[PDB]
Write an enzyme that holds these catalytic residues in place. Sequence first.
Site, PDB file in Angstrom:
ATOM      1  N   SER A 121      -9.457  58.383 101.243  1.00 34.96           N
ATOM      2  CA  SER A 121      -8.415  59.179 100.410  1.00 34.96           C
ATOM      3  C   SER A 121      -7.966  60.277 101.350  1.00 34.96           C
ATOM      4  O   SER A 121      -8.871  61.145 101.973  1.00 34.96           O
ATOM      5  CB  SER A 121      -8.923  59.632  99.075  1.00 34.96           C
ATOM      6  OG  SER A 121      -9.599  58.436  98.515  1.00 34.96           O
ATOM      7  N   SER A 122      -6.767  60.568 101.161  1.00 39.27           N
ATOM      8  CA  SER A 122      -6.093  61.780 101.783  1.00 39.27           C
ATOM      9  C   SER A 122      -6.249  61.801 103.581  1.00 39.27           C
ATOM     10  O   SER A 122      -5.844  60.836 103.923  1.00 39.27           O
ATOM     11  CB  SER A 122      -6.307  63.186 100.997  1.00 39.27           C
ATOM     12  OG  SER A 122      -5.752  64.089 101.662  1.00 39.27           O
TER      13      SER A 122
END
Length: 278
Positions: A121-122
């Site tokens: 994520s990210s």
Amino acid sequence: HHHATLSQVLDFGNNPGDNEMWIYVPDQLAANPAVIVALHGCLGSAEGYYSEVQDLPPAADENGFILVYPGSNDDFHCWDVATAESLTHDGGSDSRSIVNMVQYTLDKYSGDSSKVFTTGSSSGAMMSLVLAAAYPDVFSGVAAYSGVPYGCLRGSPGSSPFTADQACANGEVSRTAQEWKDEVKMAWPGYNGTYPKVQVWHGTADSVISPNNFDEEVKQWSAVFGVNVTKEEQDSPLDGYTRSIFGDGSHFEAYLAEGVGHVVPTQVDSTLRWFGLI
Ligand SMILES: *[C@@H]1O[C@H](CO)[C@@H](O)[C@H](O)[C@H]1NC(C)=O
């Protein structure tokens, strides 16, 4: 009864990125276990991501695969997606350390080298695409939640959203599909081989990483695989998620989540199906 727990592996071999390795090994493994590398975002940690995606460890218990949670203590706890070393096959830094964690795991548990996957994520989504481009010989599938196209931050003095040049995170970087494909080729010059199947997700309301990056990721991987959108499914897997299926669906798919911000929550079953583990 005994229960498996996330545990830090204090020595997994060479560690050019000076990263941490944490591992979740179910008490009962498959005979030739798969490995999923799960990558935290900036300001996060391996232990934090173990808690952020609560449905991953039970899935490991049920299927007998191993979860590897690398951890970064550098650059605001962000993954290096900027230096030549991390961006390049056998270059070094965080990506090579992650590959070394994978090799340690394959060797120790007699794992299946054809079933090594990564999700993040990210910042961890950004690194998942670095692993796809630089180590397609190691990884067979990737799932990037709310990230940035491979190579966007090449040359940047850091990889966090707090650097001066924030053109990528602000959605100001637009390159042609061919340019993004040539970026991927730069990860391993002269490599003319396969790439792992790529699944990308983004939210239309993301204030940290502009959703323009979703369009750029789509250009990048549709060019790498030479595919176009062949089908769109509304509300798949959840209300407001538009699923774009490319080609015959075996190399690239993309989800744009209406109204969702930073980050798109991990949809474990969609990602495990993509990896072929369920
Ligand atoms: C790799 O592909 C390129 C075209 O994209 C080609 O020019 C080159 O000769 C290929 N490499 C090898 C070793 O055949």
